[PDB]
């Protein structure tokens, strides 16, 4: 369960855009600065920038 330090505006069809304070389930975070998160609000998947998120 990570937190999006800020609303992330994705630009590709791989990462999803989140908001500040939004919670996203982290999936794979060992590739680089991009991990695959899963929004629990609707139920979708989309990478996310580690600099806009933090481990809570």
């Amino acid at each position: 369960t990570f937190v999006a330090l800020y609303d992330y505006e994705s630009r590709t069809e791989t990462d999803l855009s989140f908001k500040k304070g939004e919670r996203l389930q982290i999936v794979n975070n060992t590739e680089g600065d991009w991990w695959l998160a899963h929004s629990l609000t609707t139920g979708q998947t989309g990478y996310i920038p580690s600099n806009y998120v933090a481990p809570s």
Partner: peptide, 7 residues
């Protein structure tokens, strides 16, 4: 496969 400009 660059990160965005943090706020």
């Amino acid at each position: 496969x660059p990160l965005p400009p943090l706020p």
